[model samples]
Target: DTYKLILNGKTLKGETTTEAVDAXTAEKVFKQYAXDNGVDGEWTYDDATKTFTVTE
Candidate 1:
């Protein structure tokens, strides 16, 4: 599965904010961003949350 991050109605590929941090951190931000944008899937700030949920 691929981890996709949608921000401000835009989808961001890869982890982090195009900067360079831990994929997990980026995932949390991405999940929140998706949820705020009406997305589905589970996210977490903890490192245990791994795996990318695809959404279209």
Candidate 2:
């Protein structure tokens, strides 16, 4: 069993669909999600569970 975010959970109205993203993947996709989405927090992805683990 695997619970995961579909394509780094990123999409756009006009994007029609953007390339997948993830922290480990090393791309803008994850750059946004991996960096607190313009906020401040710890965001990391674990492939095993297919989820982001945030720490406080």
Candidate 3:
């Protein structure tokens, strides 16, 4: 699976942001930017869906 980015309501690829083509790469990016930033609250990752959700 590829982790694509939809920046500015458009596909910007890896030009304007970090790109993740695989699951590991995706986790690394969001983990630092999103996960670390939101740990205490309802910041969760779904391994099955390969997605992250924040209920804060």
**In TM-score terms, which candidate is top?**
1
Error of 2 at 42 (Å): 1.3
Error of 1 at 29 (Å): 0.8
Best by lDDT: 1
C-alpha positional error of residue 31 in candidate 1 after TM-score superposition, expressed in Å: 0.6
Model 2 C-alpha lDDT versus the unseen true structure:
0.39
The weakest ten consecutive residues by lDDT in model 2 span 9-18
C-alpha RMSD between model 2 and the true structure: 8.1
Candidate 1 accuracy as lDDT: 0.46
Q: RMSD to native for every prediction?
A: 7.4, 8.1, 7.9
Clashing pairs in 1: none
lDDT, residue 17, candidate 3: 32
TM-score of each: 0.41, 0.30, 0.37
Summarize candidate 1's per-residue lDDT along 1-43 as a digit string, tens digits. 2344433323533343323266756566666666656655444
Per-candidate clashes come to 0, 0, 0
lDDT of each residue in 1-56, candidate 2, tens digit only: 33333332232111111244543443344445434443333445566655544333
